[PDB]
Amino acid sequence: SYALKQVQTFGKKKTAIAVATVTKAAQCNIKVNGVPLQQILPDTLRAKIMEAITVVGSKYYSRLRIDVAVHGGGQVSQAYAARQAIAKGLIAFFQKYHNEVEKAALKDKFLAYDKFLLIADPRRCEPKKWGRHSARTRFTKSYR
Amino acid sequence: EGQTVRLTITSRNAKAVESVTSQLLTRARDEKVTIHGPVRLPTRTLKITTRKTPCGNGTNTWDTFELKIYKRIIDLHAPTEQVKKITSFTMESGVDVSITILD
Amino acid sequence: GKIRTKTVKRASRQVVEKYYSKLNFDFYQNKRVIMDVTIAESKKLKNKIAGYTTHIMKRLARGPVRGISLK
Amino acid sequence: TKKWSKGQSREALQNAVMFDKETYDKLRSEVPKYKLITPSIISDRLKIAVSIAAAGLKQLCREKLIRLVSCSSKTRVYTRIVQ
Amino acid sequence: SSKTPKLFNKWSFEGLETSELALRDHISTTAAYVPHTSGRWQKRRFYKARMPIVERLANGLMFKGRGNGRKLQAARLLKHTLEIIHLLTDENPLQVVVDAVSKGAPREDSTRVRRQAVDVSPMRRVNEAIYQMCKGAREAAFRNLKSMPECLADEIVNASKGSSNSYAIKKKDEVERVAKANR
Amino acid sequence: SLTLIPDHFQHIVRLLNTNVEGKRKVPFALRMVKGVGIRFAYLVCKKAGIDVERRAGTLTAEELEKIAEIIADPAKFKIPDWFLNRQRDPKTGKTEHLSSSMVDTRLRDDLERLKKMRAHRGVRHAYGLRVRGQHTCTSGRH
Amino acid sequence: QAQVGLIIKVLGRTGSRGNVTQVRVRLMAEAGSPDYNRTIVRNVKGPCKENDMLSLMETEREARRL
Amino acid sequence: NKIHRIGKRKGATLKDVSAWRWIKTAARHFKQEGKIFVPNCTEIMKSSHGRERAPQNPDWYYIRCAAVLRAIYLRPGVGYGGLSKRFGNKKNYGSRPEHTVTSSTGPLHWACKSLTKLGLVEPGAQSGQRLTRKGHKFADSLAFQVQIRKFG
RNA sequence: AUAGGAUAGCGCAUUCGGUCGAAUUCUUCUCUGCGGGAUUCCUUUGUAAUUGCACAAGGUGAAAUUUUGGGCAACAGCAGGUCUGUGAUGCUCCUCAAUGUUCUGGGCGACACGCGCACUACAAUGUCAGUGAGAACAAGAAAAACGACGUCGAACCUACUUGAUCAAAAGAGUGGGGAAACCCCGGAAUCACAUAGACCCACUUGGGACCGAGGAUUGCAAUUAUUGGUCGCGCAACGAGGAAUGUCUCGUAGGCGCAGCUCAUCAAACUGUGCCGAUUACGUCCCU
Ligand SMILES: [K+]
Ligand SMILES: [Mg+2]
Ligand SMILES: [Mg+2]
Ligand SMILES: [Mg+2]
Ligand SMILES: [Mg+2]
Ligand SMILES: [Mg+2]
Ligand SMILES: [Mg+2]
Ligand SMILES: [Mg+2]
Ligand SMILES: [Mg+2]
Ligand SMILES: [Mg+2]
Ligand SMILES: [Mg+2]
Ligand SMILES: [Mg+2]
Ligand SMILES: [Mg+2]
Ligand SMILES: [Mg+2]
Ligand SMILES: [Mg+2]
Ligand code: NA
Ligand code: NA
Ligand code: NA
Ligand code: NA
């Protein structure tokens, strides 16, 4: 009876929340909401999600089953949340089942390329105030 | 195991609803009944926005009046007589406690 | 700006005067002392008091401070 | 007056909507010699509509007289076959 | 197993360098896969200079109410534009874009009291070059059969060559001529 | 469609006393005829068995006759009554599809009938005013 | 054509509306050049800062101090 | 080469291939088999009142049936209203601001009925529609064919 | 593949919210009443200091300066607005063919014209026809009435089915929800699509104003179109707008929809909500 090697992480961007379950399997298999990476559209968002792999290399992702479930937000925010969950999932798995020279060299590579791969973006929608059509845009003034 | 009784505690006052929930939990622990856990249901905000002026002159300023509603539930497997004994105490004003039997 | 109001400055001076021996150059330990030795509603005010209290301690080690009377 | 903008005018285009023998032969002969091939360019050279220009460019691509470089639902970019 | 990024997995960033001695610290040649980063580049005064130059081009394409906020569309237009630039120049489109940005803005302008000739900061040169090239391409494709990526490619290539057929170069020559007359 | 231009191509096609551009696609050239919209033209092409991808300049005389026949009597070619612009005539109670100058003439008849009965809508038409209850104040301003 | 200069000091924003920055610029030339380590005062349009570089073209006119 | 199995990977299911490519292949199979029931009103109606013109693809009903089958596969128990939200669109209201409108449930009811007569969709217990075992088998086998690049 | 490029997988192959399975275990996501956390805290060959109060860059960090956005907000005033909010009010006017109060009908909408503020556009960074992935804030039914024999049960919102052996809008049947429970795994629109789709620079498949005919729906009543839906009308301007002029510095502007609110029926308004997401400056006292 082989032991179960599994971790669960989350990535956040705006309202979108992505939860990534990373487990040791027969071979690498990463899917977002049940969809393989190669079927994710557009290519721009697919490349953004694939950045979580190509920045450190697919060798560290080998034999890892990653399932990412994303809810809330939009297509861009969900992709950014998914890529953060994948990057954090790799770090957490190496933290739990490896040593500290790993999960640090990987962490430095992730942080050197993009801080938002691991640290969530705190930017949120500013509330609308009365007397304004939006957060800042005041009503049009006329003088005569 | 036995029948399940649901205690629904709702109040406009957060302090009052918390004190009633703690008192109910402490009394249940004294009676040694098996309680599930006090679940804090999402707080609901009643919002009413009105124009400040009573006549409609000047800058169109507004008032945002908010009323917050707090709700808790406690599940315990006790006979109706025991739940009545636990519930029978002096509660704060403005706090509503409801009794429901789960099926 | 981050100018400390007279409320923070007066409280910090009183704290240093009464509990000089228990304070040091570290904000976090100074803050922990201040939570116990002061009564206030505002956590933000207590944090500001601790910051200036540490500043007063640093100035005290270099020399005397006007308004600080250590017996 | 009432119309403040100048309202300039441009010479109208007379692009053909159906191929003819001369333009079709030109598309089959001189177009595969171009380094950059797009329906807008072919429309300019052959004085034809972009719709039939793109249809002709598609036919050359299937015949492998030209190769497709950049492809999208709205954008097709072609080039001449190497050598 | 970690390779360097290539824009759209096709164009290499190796050797990407601006010929101008100025603008070298204000044109970013950092490698990236796509011109889409959710970075807070406007937080500081000069942080926007570190943003990748192609992404800056993508942001410049997001003008008018019908174009505001369409960054995925801008990336697609840039991808087609780079392919057309490669076909036109037989050179790395990233290098062509860098050359166009380096040469697309006037070095001397006029301000102010009477009009007086003044130098242009390198940050403004990069900003204006992107702004004018995008403006020229957008206005050229307004009611023309030629598509926007084709118009953008022609503007960038002409700007890279320094040709007067570029909208940005034409404005740069006029501004410099007026600035020289205002010396 | 890569088909060469036929020798009989007409840039202007006569159909129901209307000049129809042969450069346009068949359904979008039929809509030039008054009484036929984009939806009706597509249905006319379907009932006539004409490929909508063809240009209108390649339509032969027989197909033009079939198109004119279908537009004249859509109900004969199994076009539903809810698809016609005049389903129950207020004067005759008959279902038909007006086309060409028939639409203008029947509009004149409708205006004449309302203005003869002195109905409110007829008075508004006679005075050249909005008839559908729209606020004419700060509107139109010729 | 144009001579490169390095901004070694920002003297301050000048003129009404504060859109022009007055700076001290050291001409960048090789050793032995007549303009080697020659510092001139210039007026700059656009956001500039210390250690920025300018293309001066003409290097004779000196901005009046303000 | 391209259709080579990546490694340790066998077969294919839905959600593992291109959604449009599967739908086109499924619609092509429906038309080629010629057993599905196509209502005559599909040649005269718009897919929804929110559209301004009729569908331009002559095989739009076969495409819609394939899309409905895949939607039922993804969301078992979905009804006509749920599918209407999926196939809705923004409507042009003239000089008035645009608004979203759900697709007409009529064509969706026809599509579900046609898929039912094919033995692929059955009324799910406690409301809604669901795929039969035949429908699940058909969808996954077609997904594998898409991956293998048969396409018909 | 019709012509089929680019894009990770190299002890155990993946998938199945209807498989309306069965056992376990748990709190990574979600809910929240109190707490924690950030303060100039740390470091400068820095600015200043020869004192202090502080400032600027970087560090630390989810967050680095009033953390962000709001609420509250002194003292003096205005003959500002409101007697069309109140059983808040002096003086004054009408008071039984009344300036009270009902009912009927009409008007508040009426157009040679001028002005404020919006909506839709002038198109290809597009319009149509498809396909895909996908938010958040929120709302939801009734009594000292009435029907059934002191308790439900119909008013409200919805899902599913049917209508359907043939348009939309309808009309029906059944079930659920007092609302983290049903709606709902909330399939919003911007958006995306290598969709081998149509259009190709034209007042044109741009733009839908004006108008005609059928039908349905709310209401006691739709004529002066209540409002949806269908087919016509598109030959109504409009191809980017003179002098002038408004708002705005970060998840902001702009775009994009959604909910609430007015509501029997009707949002181009407002109050909120989320989605896509920049350019520019981080300066000055020239204008106000
Ligand atoms: K209509
Ligand atoms: Mg859809
Ligand atoms: Mg529109
Ligand atoms: Mg519109
Ligand atoms: Mg709109
Ligand atoms: Mg007054
Ligand atoms: Mg009074
Ligand atoms: Mg009025
Ligand atoms: Mg678009
Ligand atoms: Mg239209
Ligand atoms: Mg009435
Ligand atoms: Mg009507
Ligand atoms: Mg038109
Ligand atoms: Mg209003
Ligand atoms: Mg001033
Ligand atoms: Na106003
Ligand atoms: Na164009
Ligand atoms: Na007006
Ligand atoms: Na940091």
How would you describe this protein?
The structure is cut from a larger assembly and holds eight protein chains of eight kinds. Chain A has 144 residues and is an alpha+beta fold. Chain A has three helices and five strands, in the order ββββαβαα. Chain A has a single domain, classed as Ribosomal Protein S5, domain 2 (2-Layer Sandwich), CATH 3.30.230. A five-stranded mixed beta sheet of chain A has the order 1-2-5-3-4. In chain A, strand 1 and strand 2 form a beta hairpin. Chain B is built from two helices and five strands; from the N terminus they run βαβββαβ. In chain B, strands 1, 2, 3, 4 and 5 form a five-stranded antiparallel beta sheet that branches. By secondary structure, chain D is α+β, with helices and mostly antiparallel strands. Chain D contains three helices and two strands. Chain D is elongated, with a radius of gyration of 16 Å. Chain D starts with 20 loop residues before the first helix and ends with a strand. Chains in contact: A-B, A-E, A-H, D-E, D-F, E-G, F-H. The interface between E and G is medium-sized, with 26 and 24 residues. Strand 2 of chain E pairs parallel with strand 3 of chain G. Bound molecules: potassium ion, magnesium ion (14 copies) and sodium ion (NA) (4 copies). One sodium ion binds next to loops of chain E. Chain H binds one RNA strand of 288 nucleotides through helix 1, helix 2, helix 3, helix 4 and strand 4. Chain A: Belongs to the universal ribosomal protein uS9 family.
